[PDB]
Design a protein around this nucleic acid. Sequence first.
RNA 1: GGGCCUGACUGCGAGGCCUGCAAGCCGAGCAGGGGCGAAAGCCGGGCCUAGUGAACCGGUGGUCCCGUGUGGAAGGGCCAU
RNA 2: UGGUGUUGGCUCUUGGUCGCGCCUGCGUAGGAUAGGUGGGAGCCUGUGAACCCCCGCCUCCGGGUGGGGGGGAGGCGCCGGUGAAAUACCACCCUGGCGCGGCUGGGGGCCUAACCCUCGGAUGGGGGGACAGCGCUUGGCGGGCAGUUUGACUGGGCGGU
RNA 3: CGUAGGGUUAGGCGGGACCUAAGGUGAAGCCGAAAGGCGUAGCCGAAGGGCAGCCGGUUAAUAUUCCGGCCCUUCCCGCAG
RNA 4: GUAGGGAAACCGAGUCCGAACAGGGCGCAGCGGCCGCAAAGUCCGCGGCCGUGGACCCGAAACCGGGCGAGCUAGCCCUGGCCAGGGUGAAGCUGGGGUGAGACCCAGUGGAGGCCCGAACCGGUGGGGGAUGCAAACCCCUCGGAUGAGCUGGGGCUAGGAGUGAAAAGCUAACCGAGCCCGGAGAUAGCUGGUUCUCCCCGAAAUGACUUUAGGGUCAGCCUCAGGCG
RNA 5: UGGUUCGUGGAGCCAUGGGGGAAUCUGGGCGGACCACCGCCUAAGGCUAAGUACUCCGGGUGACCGAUAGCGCACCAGUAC
RNA 6: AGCCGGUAGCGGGCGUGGAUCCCUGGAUGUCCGAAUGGGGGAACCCGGCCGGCGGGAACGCCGGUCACCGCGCGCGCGGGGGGAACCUGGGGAACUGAAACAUCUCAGUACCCAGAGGAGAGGAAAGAGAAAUCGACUCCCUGAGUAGCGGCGAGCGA
Lengths: 97, 73
Amino acid sequence: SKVCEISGKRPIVANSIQRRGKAKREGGVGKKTTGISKRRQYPNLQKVRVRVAGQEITFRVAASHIPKVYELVERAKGLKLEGLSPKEIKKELLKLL
Amino acid sequence: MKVILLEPLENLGDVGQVVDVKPGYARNYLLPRGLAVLATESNLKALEARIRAQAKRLAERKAEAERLKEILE
RNA sequence: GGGCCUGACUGCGAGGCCUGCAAGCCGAGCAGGGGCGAAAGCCGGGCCUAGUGAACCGGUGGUCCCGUGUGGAAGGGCCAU
RNA sequence: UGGUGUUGGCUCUUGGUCGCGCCUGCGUAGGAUAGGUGGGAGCCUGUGAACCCCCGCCUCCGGGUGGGGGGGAGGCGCCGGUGAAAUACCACCCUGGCGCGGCUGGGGGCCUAACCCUCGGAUGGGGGGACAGCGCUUGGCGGGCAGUUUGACUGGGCGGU
RNA sequence: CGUAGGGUUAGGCGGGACCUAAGGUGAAGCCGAAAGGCGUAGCCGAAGGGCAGCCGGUUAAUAUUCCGGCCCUUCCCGCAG
RNA sequence: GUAGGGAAACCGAGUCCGAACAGGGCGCAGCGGCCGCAAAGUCCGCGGCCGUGGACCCGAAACCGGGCGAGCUAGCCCUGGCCAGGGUGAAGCUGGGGUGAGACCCAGUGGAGGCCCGAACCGGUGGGGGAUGCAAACCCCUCGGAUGAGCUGGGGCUAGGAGUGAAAAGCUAACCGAGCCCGGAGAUAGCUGGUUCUCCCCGAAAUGACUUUAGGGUCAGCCUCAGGCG
RNA sequence: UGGUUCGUGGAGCCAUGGGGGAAUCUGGGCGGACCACCGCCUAAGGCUAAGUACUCCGGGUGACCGAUAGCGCACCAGUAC
RNA sequence: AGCCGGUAGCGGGCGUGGAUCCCUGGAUGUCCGAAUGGGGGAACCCGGCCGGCGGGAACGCCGGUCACCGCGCGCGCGGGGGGAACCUGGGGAACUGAAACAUCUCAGUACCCAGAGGAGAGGAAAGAGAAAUCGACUCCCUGAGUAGCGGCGAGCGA
Ligand SMILES: [Mg+2]
Ligand SMILES: [Mg+2]
Ligand SMILES: [Mg+2]
Ligand SMILES: [Mg+2]
Ligand SMILES: [Mg+2]
Ligand SMILES: [Mg+2]
Ligand SMILES: [Mg+2]
Ligand SMILES: [Mg+2]
Ligand SMILES: [Mg+2]
Ligand SMILES: [Mg+2]
Ligand SMILES: [Mg+2]
Ligand SMILES: [Mg+2]
Ligand SMILES: [Mg+2]
Ligand SMILES: [Mg+2]
Ligand SMILES: [Mg+2]
Ligand SMILES: [Mg+2]
Ligand SMILES: [Mg+2]
Ligand SMILES: [Mg+2]
Ligand SMILES: [Mg+2]
Ligand SMILES: [Mg+2]
Ligand SMILES: [Mg+2]
Ligand SMILES: [Mg+2]
Ligand SMILES: [Mg+2]
Ligand SMILES: [Mg+2]
Ligand SMILES: [Mg+2]
Ligand SMILES: [Mg+2]
Ligand SMILES: [Mg+2]
Ligand SMILES: [Mg+2]
Ligand SMILES: [Mg+2]
Ligand SMILES: [Mg+2]
Ligand SMILES: [Mg+2]
Ligand SMILES: [Mg+2]
Ligand SMILES: [Mg+2]
Ligand SMILES: [Mg+2]
Ligand SMILES: [Mg+2]
Ligand SMILES: [Mg+2]
Ligand SMILES: [Mg+2]
Ligand SMILES: [Mg+2]
Ligand SMILES: [Mg+2]
Ligand SMILES: [Mg+2]
Ligand SMILES: [Mg+2]
Ligand SMILES: [Mg+2]
Ligand SMILES: [Mg+2]
Ligand SMILES: [Mg+2]
Ligand SMILES: [Mg+2]
Ligand SMILES: [Mg+2]
Ligand SMILES: [Mg+2]
Ligand SMILES: [Mg+2]
Ligand SMILES: [Mg+2]
Ligand SMILES: [Mg+2]
Ligand SMILES: [Mg+2]
Ligand SMILES: [Mg+2]
Ligand SMILES: [Mg+2]
Ligand SMILES: [Mg+2]
Ligand SMILES: [Mg+2]
Ligand SMILES: [Mg+2]
Ligand SMILES: [Mg+2]
Ligand SMILES: [Mg+2]
Ligand SMILES: [Mg+2]
Ligand SMILES: [Mg+2]
Ligand SMILES: [Mg+2]
Ligand SMILES: [Mg+2]
Ligand SMILES: [Mg+2]
Ligand SMILES: [Mg+2]
Ligand SMILES: [Mg+2]
Ligand SMILES: [Mg+2]
Ligand SMILES: [Mg+2]
Ligand SMILES: [Mg+2]
Ligand SMILES: [Mg+2]
Ligand SMILES: [Mg+2]
Ligand SMILES: [Mg+2]
Ligand SMILES: [Mg+2]
Ligand SMILES: [Mg+2]
Ligand SMILES: [Mg+2]
Ligand SMILES: [Mg+2]
Ligand SMILES: [Mg+2]
Ligand SMILES: [Mg+2]
Ligand SMILES: [Mg+2]
Ligand SMILES: [Mg+2]
Ligand SMILES: [Mg+2]
Ligand SMILES: [Mg+2]
Ligand SMILES: [Mg+2]
Ligand SMILES: [Mg+2]
Ligand SMILES: [Mg+2]
Ligand SMILES: [Mg+2]
Ligand SMILES: [Mg+2]
Ligand SMILES: [Mg+2]
Ligand SMILES: [Mg+2]
Ligand SMILES: [Mg+2]
Ligand SMILES: [Mg+2]
Ligand SMILES: [Mg+2]
Ligand SMILES: [Mg+2]
Ligand SMILES: [Mg+2]
Ligand SMILES: [Mg+2]
Ligand SMILES: [Mg+2]
Ligand SMILES: [Mg+2]
Ligand SMILES: [Mg+2]
Ligand SMILES: [Mg+2]
Ligand SMILES: [Mg+2]
Ligand SMILES: [Mg+2]
Ligand SMILES: [Mg+2]
Ligand SMILES: [Mg+2]
Ligand SMILES: [Mg+2]
Ligand SMILES: [Mg+2]
Ligand SMILES: [Mg+2]
Ligand SMILES: [Mg+2]
Ligand SMILES: [Mg+2]
Ligand SMILES: [Mg+2]
Ligand SMILES: [Mg+2]
Ligand SMILES: [Mg+2]
Ligand SMILES: [Mg+2]
Ligand SMILES: [Mg+2]
Ligand SMILES: [Mg+2]
Ligand SMILES: [Mg+2]
Ligand SMILES: [Mg+2]
Ligand SMILES: [Mg+2]
Ligand SMILES: [Mg+2]
Ligand SMILES: [Mg+2]
Ligand SMILES: [Mg+2]
Ligand SMILES: [Mg+2]
Ligand SMILES: [Mg+2]
Ligand SMILES: [Mg+2]
Ligand SMILES: [Mg+2]
Ligand SMILES: [Mg+2]
Ligand SMILES: [Mg+2]
Ligand SMILES: [Mg+2]
Ligand SMILES: [Mg+2]
Ligand SMILES: [Mg+2]
Ligand SMILES: [Mg+2]
Ligand SMILES: [Mg+2]
Ligand SMILES: [Mg+2]
Ligand SMILES: [Mg+2]
Ligand SMILES: [Mg+2]
Ligand SMILES: [Mg+2]
Ligand SMILES: [Mg+2]
Ligand SMILES: [Mg+2]
Ligand SMILES: [Mg+2]
Ligand SMILES: [Mg+2]
Ligand SMILES: [Mg+2]
Ligand SMILES: [Mg+2]
Ligand SMILES: [Mg+2]
Ligand SMILES: [Mg+2]
Ligand SMILES: [Mg+2]
Ligand SMILES: [Mg+2]
Ligand SMILES: [Mg+2]
Ligand SMILES: [Mg+2]
Ligand SMILES: [Mg+2]
Ligand SMILES: [Mg+2]
Ligand SMILES: [Mg+2]
Ligand SMILES: [Mg+2]
Ligand SMILES: [Mg+2]
Ligand SMILES: [Mg+2]
Ligand SMILES: [Mg+2]
Ligand SMILES: [Mg+2]
Ligand SMILES: [Mg+2]
Ligand SMILES: [Mg+2]
Ligand SMILES: [Mg+2]
Ligand SMILES: [Mg+2]
Ligand SMILES: [Mg+2]
Ligand SMILES: [Mg+2]
Ligand SMILES: [Mg+2]
Ligand SMILES: [Mg+2]
Ligand SMILES: [Mg+2]
Ligand SMILES: [Mg+2]
Ligand SMILES: [Mg+2]
Ligand SMILES: [Mg+2]
Ligand SMILES: [Mg+2]
Ligand SMILES: [Mg+2]
Ligand SMILES: [Mg+2]
Ligand SMILES: [Mg+2]
Ligand SMILES: [Mg+2]
Ligand SMILES: [Mg+2]
Ligand SMILES: [Mg+2]
Ligand SMILES: [Mg+2]
Ligand SMILES: [Mg+2]
Ligand SMILES: [Mg+2]
Ligand SMILES: [Mg+2]
Ligand SMILES: [Mg+2]
Ligand SMILES: [Mg+2]
Ligand SMILES: [Mg+2]
Ligand SMILES: [Mg+2]
Ligand SMILES: [Mg+2]
Ligand SMILES: [Mg+2]
Ligand SMILES: [Mg+2]
Ligand SMILES: [Mg+2]
Ligand SMILES: [Mg+2]
Ligand SMILES: [Mg+2]
Ligand SMILES: [Mg+2]
Ligand SMILES: [Mg+2]
Ligand SMILES: [Mg+2]
Ligand SMILES: [Mg+2]
Ligand SMILES: [Mg+2]
Ligand SMILES: [Mg+2]
Ligand SMILES: [Mg+2]
Ligand SMILES: [Mg+2]
Ligand SMILES: [Mg+2]
Ligand SMILES: [Mg+2]
Ligand SMILES: [Mg+2]
Ligand SMILES: [Mg+2]
Ligand SMILES: [Mg+2]
Ligand SMILES: [Mg+2]
Ligand SMILES: [Mg+2]
Ligand SMILES: [Mg+2]
Ligand SMILES: [Mg+2]
Ligand SMILES: [Mg+2]
Ligand SMILES: [Mg+2]
Ligand SMILES: [Mg+2]
Ligand SMILES: [Mg+2]
Ligand SMILES: [Mg+2]
Ligand SMILES: [Mg+2]
Ligand SMILES: [Mg+2]
Ligand SMILES: [Mg+2]
Ligand SMILES: [Mg+2]
Ligand SMILES: [Mg+2]
Ligand SMILES: [Mg+2]
Ligand SMILES: [Mg+2]
Ligand SMILES: [Mg+2]
Ligand SMILES: [Mg+2]
Ligand SMILES: [Mg+2]
Ligand SMILES: [Mg+2]
Ligand SMILES: [Mg+2]
Ligand SMILES: [Mg+2]
Ligand SMILES: [Mg+2]
Ligand SMILES: [Mg+2]
Ligand SMILES: [Mg+2]
Ligand SMILES: [Mg+2]
Ligand SMILES: [Mg+2]
Ligand SMILES: [Mg+2]
Ligand SMILES: [Mg+2]
Ligand SMILES: [Mg+2]
Ligand SMILES: [Mg+2]
Ligand SMILES: [Mg+2]
Ligand SMILES: [Mg+2]
Ligand SMILES: [Mg+2]
Ligand SMILES: [Mg+2]
Ligand SMILES: [Mg+2]
Ligand SMILES: [Mg+2]
Ligand SMILES: [Mg+2]
Ligand SMILES: [Mg+2]
Ligand SMILES: [Mg+2]
Ligand SMILES: [Mg+2]
Ligand SMILES: [Mg+2]
Ligand SMILES: [Mg+2]
Ligand SMILES: [Mg+2]
Ligand SMILES: [Mg+2]
Ligand SMILES: [Mg+2]
Ligand SMILES: [Mg+2]
Ligand SMILES: [Mg+2]
Ligand SMILES: [Mg+2]
Ligand SMILES: [Mg+2]
Ligand SMILES: [Mg+2]
Ligand SMILES: [Mg+2]
Ligand SMILES: [Mg+2]
Ligand SMILES: [Mg+2]
Ligand SMILES: [Mg+2]
Ligand SMILES: [Mg+2]
Ligand SMILES: [Mg+2]
Ligand SMILES: [Mg+2]
Ligand SMILES: [Mg+2]
Ligand SMILES: [Mg+2]
Ligand SMILES: [Mg+2]
Ligand SMILES: [Mg+2]
Ligand SMILES: [Mg+2]
Ligand SMILES: [Mg+2]
Ligand SMILES: [Mg+2]
Ligand SMILES: [Mg+2]
Ligand SMILES: [Mg+2]
Ligand SMILES: [Mg+2]
Ligand SMILES: [Mg+2]
Ligand SMILES: [Mg+2]
Ligand SMILES: [Mg+2]
Ligand SMILES: [Mg+2]
Ligand SMILES: [Mg+2]
Ligand SMILES: [Mg+2]
Ligand SMILES: [Mg+2]
Ligand SMILES: [Mg+2]
Ligand SMILES: [Mg+2]
Ligand SMILES: [Mg+2]
Ligand SMILES: [Mg+2]
Ligand SMILES: [Mg+2]
Ligand SMILES: [Mg+2]
Ligand SMILES: [Mg+2]
Ligand SMILES: [Mg+2]
Ligand SMILES: [Mg+2]
Ligand SMILES: [Mg+2]
Ligand SMILES: [Mg+2]
Ligand SMILES: [Mg+2]
Ligand SMILES: [Mg+2]
Ligand SMILES: [Mg+2]
Ligand SMILES: [Mg+2]
Ligand SMILES: [Mg+2]
Ligand SMILES: [Mg+2]
C-alpha cells in the first residue's frame, strides 16, 4: 500500500472506538467506550496498465481516480512519444499536470 | 460510461453511435483493441466536426449537382 | 361489629429532636380545596421503633422556562415520577 | 465471514420493480359468469353476419375467449325486467396469469479481457479466471498476546461477619 | 621500571596489485509513513584455491630478507624458427 | 466593587415557591462641630496557610522511546585441523562339510562399530583443603565420553517481549521469570531516616462518625493566636 | 476517523481511507442536525518582507559563585581511568 | 621599537631601508571524512584515458579528469552531507493523575524521521458571527479559567 501515483493518496492514521450499551436516542442508557484501537487506513490501490506508444506502462492509482489516467493519455496525443522507454514515458505522462 | 462506437458490433448499435457501457468492460476489452473511445467534451467537437464535415462535403456535392441540373434539360 | 368516606391531601410551616456532614425523627398552626359528627371536634396513613439507597445516566407523563441572527425544531430545564 | 471496490461478456433459470400485447374475475335479484371511477343514446358485417363443426384456454360444472371452416349479411343496447350497481361499443387502472420488452436479483453453465502463476522464447503462448490477492464496512472465532482487577474485618488462611 | 642512542633490509617467506565460501552488499528490479527492508546477474568476503628458494656465514642484536655458491619466477624489448 | 432573587424567562431591595396581598427561605440601611475624622471598598509590600508546579530533602521494584552488543555463552553457516597407543573381531572372500541343489556350520584370510581399556582432549561424580583463597569458581586424588550425537581454529548469521535452547524459564560480556547505555524523569513511594544558632510564653490527642477503612486521609472534640462580648 | 471546548451526543464546521457523485453566478459553501427566510464569502494551484522564538557565538551589566562553589573542564578535560 | 608563540637554554640571524603584531584578499592546502574513477575494517590498497621526468617499453613519480540522481536542448545546470537550541510537517509511549483502574491523563510530551531558513509555519476569505458591524498572516495583553466539554470524576479548555 504505497502512495498513489496521480493524486498522491496514502494510508493515514485512524482509530476504531469500540462501543457497548444502548444509546440515549433509542431510549437506553447511553453509548460507552470499551476500547480504542489505532489503525492505518489503507487506500484501495490496484495496477492499471496502459499500453502507450507501443510500450506497456504500469500505474498504481486509486480506483476512484481511474478515468484521470485515461484522460492524461488521451490528452497526451500532442507530444511525440515514440522511441522513449516506458520509464520516461511514465515520466512524461505526468507532465500534463 | 459514454463511448463512441468506432466499429459496428453486434447487439450494440450503429458505427459512431454513442453508447454507455460498464467502464471495466471497455478498459479491458474495447479500448485496448482500438474498438471504442470514451465520449469526452473534445471528441464531441470532433464527432460534430466529422459529421459536419461530411455535411460540408454533402451540401457542396448535391448543390453542385442541382446547379448542373439547372444547366441541363 | 357495622355506616359514610379518601386528609395513605395541595401550597406551606412556628420551633425543636437528633446531630460531625449529609442526614432521620416530632410538629401545633395559616390558606386553597375536602371527609365525617348533631356538635365539639377529629383526618398530612397504620399503637410505635426495622420492611432501606446518596450523586452520576436515561425514560415516562406533564409543565410551556430556554431556542447560538431569526420563525419553528432538535435537545435540554422545571415538576412529579 | 456477508457487502461493496480492483471487475467483464454470454446464456439458462426464476424473482422484485416499470412500458406494453394481454387473458382471467360467476352471492338475492337480474337474457350471459355484473371489476370500479368517469364517458353513453347507437355500435359491426367485402378488417364478411345469425348460426355450424375440428382444437387451445379459464372452467364456480354453466360457460368465457381466441378463433378456424361453411353459410355469407344478420344480431346485441339505452328502453324494461332488475338489483346497491345493467348490459353494446370506445378511455383511466385494478385481482390474478401468460407472451414481449426497461431496469434489476440471485444462483447453473460458457467465454476471456482485468488479476495471479508459468514458459531459453514475454505486444506471444499456456493454466486458473472474474475466482483468489488486495481497500473499507459488517458480525464472529479470538490467553496467541496486551493492559488491569481479583474487597476489608480478623487475638494469616478456613469458616463466619 | 627511570635516559638517550642504536636495532626490523624480501621478484622467492605470509599478504595486497588474482579467484572464489558462507556472507556483506548490490546495476535490473520488488516492497515500505519516513529512517529503510529485499534483490538471479555483478562487486566484496581466507588459514580455502592458485604462486615462482634450499643451504651456510655473519653482527650488540635482522636475516630463506644483506653476502656467498648454486637453482628458479613474471613482464618488456631484440633475434630465430 | 457598589443590588439582589430565581433553572430560566423575568422582576428587583426585593425575589422564589405558591392560587394567596399565607407563612418561610434567600438579600436590603459611621463619630463629632457643608468640613475634620473614621469606614464599607480598592492597591502595593511584607509574613501564615492552601492550590498547580518536582513543592521539605535522600531512596526503589520497575513501565515504556531510541541507540549498543553473539570476541562470553546457545544454536546453526563457510572453510580448516586433530583424536598417543592396545583390546574385541560383523559382514565379505579362499579353503571343507551339508543338501538332489540351498539354508547353515567349523579353520585361514578378512576389518565393521553413536564397541571396550586407556593418555593428549572435553568433562565436573565423591571427599579433602580453599572461603578478606592462587582464583568473583582454583589445587589434589578419584571418576564418565574419548572415530563420534566428536574435539576445537577462523570467517560468519541469528536479540529485548526478541533470540537461542538434545529444556534449566537455562544463557545472550561474571547478579537474565525479561539484557546494557542514554533519554521522557527530578517516574513514583500513604513507606524508612535525617531535618542545622539562642532565651521567654501556652500546652494536646492517641476518642466518636464514615471511609477497598484499618501503621493513610474528611469532619467533630482537645491546643494556640489577634478582635469583640463581660 | 481525526482537529475544534466537545469523550457521540440535537454534533455542525475544517482535512479524508472506502463506494458513488454533481454543477458555473439563475452558480456554489457558512451562519452549529433539519426546513423556510435573511445576512457573510468564492473552495478543488501556489506565492508573500514586516511584528515573534531561540543560542555555537562578540560584547556590555549584576544585593549571581569565589576551586566539594561557578559548567563534565578557572590547571593540556570530554582528558586520566 | 624590539622580535622570531608556549619557550628559558644549546646554538643562530632579523628589525625607523617600519621587523614582531592585528584586519582583509589571494596563493598554497598531504590523507580521511557527503568522498565521489574504484574497493574498503577513516586517514588505506588499486586502476581508465590523456599531458610530463629517469636511459624508460617492462617500473615508478607527477599533471587533469573519471561515482549516483533530477532537470534543460555527450554537453550544462544543480541536487546529497552539517550545525547550540529555536520551525513546520510526517510518525508518536509510559511512569503517573484519577489515591486503584479500562473511556479519561501525563500528551502531540519525550524520543523517531524528513526537509527549511537565518527564521520557520502562516498568509489577502466558500473567514468571523448577529453586532444595521468587522475586513490579510504572525506576536503580546485581556476576554477567562468565562463559554464550554468531561467514568460531568480527576482534570481539561477555547
Ligand atoms: Mg502493507
Ligand atoms: Mg493529501
Ligand atoms: Mg492526514
Ligand atoms: Mg487518540
Ligand atoms: Mg476493525
Ligand atoms: Mg465504530
Ligand atoms: Mg464494532
Ligand atoms: Mg453498536
Ligand atoms: Mg453490542
Ligand atoms: Mg453483553
Ligand atoms: Mg442491564
Ligand atoms: Mg450507532
Ligand atoms: Mg425520545
Ligand atoms: Mg444514526
Ligand atoms: Mg429495544
Ligand atoms: Mg488504549
Ligand atoms: Mg493495528
Ligand atoms: Mg520491444
Ligand atoms: Mg509485462
Ligand atoms: Mg507495479
Ligand atoms: Mg536508450
Ligand atoms: Mg496544462
Ligand atoms: Mg446489446
Ligand atoms: Mg493490429
Ligand atoms: Mg444522384
Ligand atoms: Mg434526359
Ligand atoms: Mg405542587
Ligand atoms: Mg412568627
Ligand atoms: Mg439550637
Ligand atoms: Mg440522626
Ligand atoms: Mg455541633
Ligand atoms: Mg418527553
Ligand atoms: Mg409553536
Ligand atoms: Mg420537550
Ligand atoms: Mg427528557
Ligand atoms: Mg456496505
Ligand atoms: Mg351462486
Ligand atoms: Mg378512487
Ligand atoms: Mg359509486
Ligand atoms: Mg337520450
Ligand atoms: Mg334503436
Ligand atoms: Mg352456486
Ligand atoms: Mg355433476
Ligand atoms: Mg408477468
Ligand atoms: Mg433500451
Ligand atoms: Mg456465477
Ligand atoms: Mg460457476
Ligand atoms: Mg467456466
Ligand atoms: Mg462467445
Ligand atoms: Mg477453457
Ligand atoms: Mg463458441
Ligand atoms: Mg506475489
Ligand atoms: Mg525478462
Ligand atoms: Mg501479457
Ligand atoms: Mg503461437
Ligand atoms: Mg469458477
Ligand atoms: Mg493466489
Ligand atoms: Mg498485486
Ligand atoms: Mg480484505
Ligand atoms: Mg460499522
Ligand atoms: Mg451478533
Ligand atoms: Mg469486527
Ligand atoms: Mg469484536
Ligand atoms: Mg466478543
Ligand atoms: Mg471454527
Ligand atoms: Mg494473561
Ligand atoms: Mg476472553
Ligand atoms: Mg498485542
Ligand atoms: Mg505474536
Ligand atoms: Mg498498545
Ligand atoms: Mg489495551
Ligand atoms: Mg473490587
Ligand atoms: Mg485481605
Ligand atoms: Mg489487626
Ligand atoms: Mg492471630
Ligand atoms: Mg487484633
Ligand atoms: Mg486468628
Ligand atoms: Mg495459623
Ligand atoms: Mg489454606
Ligand atoms: Mg498463603
Ligand atoms: Mg489462596
Ligand atoms: Mg475470607
Ligand atoms: Mg468446619
Ligand atoms: Mg456470608
Ligand atoms: Mg628499558
Ligand atoms: Mg631483482
Ligand atoms: Mg614471514
Ligand atoms: Mg609455505
Ligand atoms: Mg618451506
Ligand atoms: Mg600473513
Ligand atoms: Mg588481511
Ligand atoms: Mg599475480
Ligand atoms: Mg590475470
Ligand atoms: Mg579482490
Ligand atoms: Mg561454497
Ligand atoms: Mg547472497
Ligand atoms: Mg551485520
Ligand atoms: Mg540489504
Ligand atoms: Mg537499492
Ligand atoms: Mg549500471
Ligand atoms: Mg554494481
Ligand atoms: Mg553502478
Ligand atoms: Mg540507477
Ligand atoms: Mg528489464
Ligand atoms: Mg522485482
Ligand atoms: Mg509483483
Ligand atoms: Mg515525506
Ligand atoms: Mg530507523
Ligand atoms: Mg527507527
Ligand atoms: Mg540502502
Ligand atoms: Mg523511500
Ligand atoms: Mg533498497
Ligand atoms: Mg536479468
Ligand atoms: Mg564479511
Ligand atoms: Mg594453520
Ligand atoms: Mg599461514
Ligand atoms: Mg592473516
Ligand atoms: Mg594456500
Ligand atoms: Mg603473491
Ligand atoms: Mg617450475
Ligand atoms: Mg658458526
Ligand atoms: Mg654469534
Ligand atoms: Mg642469534
Ligand atoms: Mg638462516
Ligand atoms: Mg651482510
Ligand atoms: Mg646492512
Ligand atoms: Mg630460465
Ligand atoms: Mg607473479
Ligand atoms: Mg604482470
Ligand atoms: Mg386569589
Ligand atoms: Mg398561574
Ligand atoms: Mg382574597
Ligand atoms: Mg408575601
Ligand atoms: Mg398560606
Ligand atoms: Mg390574608
Ligand atoms: Mg409579610
Ligand atoms: Mg436610608
Ligand atoms: Mg441605601
Ligand atoms: Mg454650636
Ligand atoms: Mg451644611
Ligand atoms: Mg483598619
Ligand atoms: Mg455593610
Ligand atoms: Mg458611607
Ligand atoms: Mg514573597
Ligand atoms: Mg485555611
Ligand atoms: Mg507559602
Ligand atoms: Mg503545595
Ligand atoms: Mg532490570
Ligand atoms: Mg526497552
Ligand atoms: Mg523498540
Ligand atoms: Mg533497541
Ligand atoms: Mg547489530
Ligand atoms: Mg565458541
Ligand atoms: Mg546460519
Ligand atoms: Mg574437511
Ligand atoms: Mg569447523
Ligand atoms: Mg589446520
Ligand atoms: Mg587407536
Ligand atoms: Mg599400532
Ligand atoms: Mg589397531
Ligand atoms: Mg580388555
Ligand atoms: Mg589380532
Ligand atoms: Mg593349498
Ligand atoms: Mg580332501
Ligand atoms: Mg593370501
Ligand atoms: Mg590380521
Ligand atoms: Mg587398563
Ligand atoms: Mg599437539
Ligand atoms: Mg587445549
Ligand atoms: Mg565444579
Ligand atoms: Mg570446568
Ligand atoms: Mg575439584
Ligand atoms: Mg564435589
Ligand atoms: Mg570439597
Ligand atoms: Mg592441598
Ligand atoms: Mg593452598
Ligand atoms: Mg556471585
Ligand atoms: Mg602437586
Ligand atoms: Mg590419595
Ligand atoms: Mg590421574
Ligand atoms: Mg597413591
Ligand atoms: Mg590409586
Ligand atoms: Mg580419565
Ligand atoms: Mg557418560
Ligand atoms: Mg561422546
Ligand atoms: Mg552437538
Ligand atoms: Mg561429524
Ligand atoms: Mg569456530
Ligand atoms: Mg577461514
Ligand atoms: Mg584470521
Ligand atoms: Mg568468529
Ligand atoms: Mg562479523
Ligand atoms: Mg529487531
Ligand atoms: Mg540487528
Ligand atoms: Mg518484534
Ligand atoms: Mg550483568
Ligand atoms: Mg545470587
Ligand atoms: Mg535476584
Ligand atoms: Mg558486583
Ligand atoms: Mg453516634
Ligand atoms: Mg482537623
Ligand atoms: Mg477529650
Ligand atoms: Mg473536659
Ligand atoms: Mg491538521
Ligand atoms: Mg479527545
Ligand atoms: Mg455519526
Ligand atoms: Mg464529531
Ligand atoms: Mg493538508
Ligand atoms: Mg479527497
Ligand atoms: Mg464503501
Ligand atoms: Mg452518487
Ligand atoms: Mg450572489
Ligand atoms: Mg431556483
Ligand atoms: Mg444526522
Ligand atoms: Mg492557495
Ligand atoms: Mg528573508
Ligand atoms: Mg517557546
Ligand atoms: Mg522566553
Ligand atoms: Mg533573544
Ligand atoms: Mg548556553
Ligand atoms: Mg562546542
Ligand atoms: Mg562564529
Ligand atoms: Mg556568549
Ligand atoms: Mg574573533
Ligand atoms: Mg576582544
Ligand atoms: Mg555592542
Ligand atoms: Mg568592542
Ligand atoms: Mg564576560
Ligand atoms: Mg560601551
Ligand atoms: Mg562590573
Ligand atoms: Mg582550598
Ligand atoms: Mg553546555
Ligand atoms: Mg561554554
Ligand atoms: Mg602548571
Ligand atoms: Mg594555561
Ligand atoms: Mg576542555
Ligand atoms: Mg579541550
Ligand atoms: Mg630560537
Ligand atoms: Mg630566543
Ligand atoms: Mg623555542
Ligand atoms: Mg621560565
Ligand atoms: Mg633561571
Ligand atoms: Mg634552564
Ligand atoms: Mg643566560
Ligand atoms: Mg645583529
Ligand atoms: Mg591518492
Ligand atoms: Mg579522492
Ligand atoms: Mg584519483
Ligand atoms: Mg578487506
Ligand atoms: Mg581492483
Ligand atoms: Mg597512485
Ligand atoms: Mg573511457
Ligand atoms: Mg613536467
Ligand atoms: Mg625529475
Ligand atoms: Mg594523481
Ligand atoms: Mg597515478
Ligand atoms: Mg549507494
Ligand atoms: Mg530510482
Ligand atoms: Mg528518491
Ligand atoms: Mg536545455
Ligand atoms: Mg540532438
Ligand atoms: Mg549522445
Ligand atoms: Mg569520450
Ligand atoms: Mg549542442
Ligand atoms: Mg557555464
Ligand atoms: Mg556550451
Ligand atoms: Mg540549464
Ligand atoms: Mg535526495
Ligand atoms: Mg537520503
Ligand atoms: Mg541531519
Ligand atoms: Mg509543534
Ligand atoms: Mg510499540
Ligand atoms: Mg496534571
Ligand atoms: Mg497512593
Ligand atoms: Mg506535567
Ligand atoms: Mg495525543
Ligand atoms: Mg500543560
Ligand atoms: Mg514535534
Ligand atoms: Mg518540556
Ligand atoms: Mg516505528
Ligand atoms: Mg526524503
Ligand atoms: Mg526535497
Ligand atoms: Mg539538509
Ligand atoms: Mg536579520
Ligand atoms: Mg518570513
Ligand atoms: Mg499549529
Ligand atoms: Mg446601511
Ligand atoms: Mg461594509
Ligand atoms: Mg485594513
Ligand atoms: Mg512578553
Ligand atoms: Mg491572545
Ligand atoms: Mg487536549
